[PDB]
């Protein structure tokens with residue numbers, strides 16, 4: 670197999686900035702103690718691609734997570750904050766668009782390459798948080 674456009678996400682990334690994540694988590698419904706501890710985390714994210722399967726791992730002092738998925742194909746995800754959600758991730762104009770659905774609610778997480786950074790934009794009900802990762 671040769672290159673894929675998604676290979677631009679592949680690598681080891683470290684969180685360097687976070688804006689409005691507490692308010693985003695509030696909107697998602699995250700409880701106090703989880704918000705405080707999760708908010709402190711400075712995770713590393715490892716993204717790899719193997720055939721049609723994309724894997725996103727996150728390692729931090731808060732929680733270690735891993736999701737593997739095929740674009741456009743819904744999967745079960747247990748989030749860092751312990752929600753059990755139905756997730757679908759697609760590629761739209763170079764941007765990984767990740768929708769999580771649970772308990773009649775929905776949130777969208779966009780991951781995109783900007784310069785040498787990987788920018789993560791999380792949106793829930795008018796509230797947006799921006800998290801920026803750099804190469805590790």
Ligand SMILES: COc1ccc(S(=O)(=O)NCCCCC(=O)O)c2ccccc12
Nearest residue numbers: 694699707710731748749750778789800
């Ligand atoms: C470190 O704490 C978290 C990580 C990921 C998630 S998530 O379910 O994967 N949605 C956010 C995804 C992008 C954030 C990031 O990877 O830096 C959390 C969701 C709610 C509260 C805390 C979360």
